[PDB]
Amino acid sequence: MAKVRIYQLAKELGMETQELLELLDQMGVAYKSHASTLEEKDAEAVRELVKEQRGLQEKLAEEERRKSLPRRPPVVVIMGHVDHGKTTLLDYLRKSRIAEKEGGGITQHVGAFEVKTPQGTVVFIDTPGHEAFTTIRQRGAKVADIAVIVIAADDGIMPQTEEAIAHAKAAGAKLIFAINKIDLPQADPEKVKRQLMERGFVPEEYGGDAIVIPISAKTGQGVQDLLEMILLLAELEDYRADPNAEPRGVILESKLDKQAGIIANMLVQEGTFRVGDYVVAGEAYGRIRAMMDADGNQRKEAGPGSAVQVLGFQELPHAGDVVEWVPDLEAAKEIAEERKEERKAREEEEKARRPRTMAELLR
């Protein structure tokens, strides 16, 4: 403290000689060499300035950390004609998880499952519908990043295929075309490619931008390439999300468990939902009483990419509705109620203008 030579003070503070001499120059403190003695007031001033500077270096480095959001896994939906193999592929992927069971392990159906891979994890949506609207249409907060369109090599592109493609494009998904059943004798992948090109999807093979991957969902051939391609796209699109943002997710589906009551499966997209949070999804609200993930584990928290079954909604939420964190029960009720009475007011819109004329009837 008093009196200290500059070399002593440098040792004390873990600074290089020239580094401390540079600081003394900044402060206008004079010295002959690092062997000079500092007045106590100067040394104290040094110790304080160094403390401050080191703290701001740290604060400045910690804020540069807090703006690189962590990666989140790609979310994938598998689509196409019901007989072309999307179901066989989804089943293959779901099985590929367990790898000679556990056992048990257990498993729970929460609307999506994860496929873990040396290159990363992929989330596959696994729900019986598409979302809502017509059959099988979607609105539809965006759920999936990538849509794998599974087309049978024998049958080729059909109307369910075209519907799947239009839905995926409408939802903003990146498309991967998976040409399935390639082992069949009547397999005609080249015809499917021509059909893709007729529709404006030119395969990369021919210098276009459409991603086309041959697979066999029955045997698993090509499925690994499909996963690697999903994960490559994820790295290039660079999907990220803030686990500390206000929680936001999307309802995948909801139902009544006779014992537990209203359950809803939701995919988390931003922030981290926690047991005890209030949420609103459309006109439905509740306190999150419990969350269970696909491995059957009770979760206190669910961050980006997690699919969980949530207990606590007081009415069935709709598929495709955004789940939003709110600060308390009062806010949950106000938001839900304002949406209800607004829908009810635009319903009186069509109970008035324009239902048009009435009844040209029997008998």
Author numbering: 1 to 363
Show passages lifted from the paper.
Here, we present the crystal structure of the eubacterial IF2 core as the individual apoprotein and in GTP-bound and GDP-bound forms.
The switch I conformation varies significantly between the apo and nucleotide-bound states, probably owing to the presence of two glycines (RIAEK­EAGG sequence) which are highly conserved and provide flexibility (as also illustrated by higher B factors).
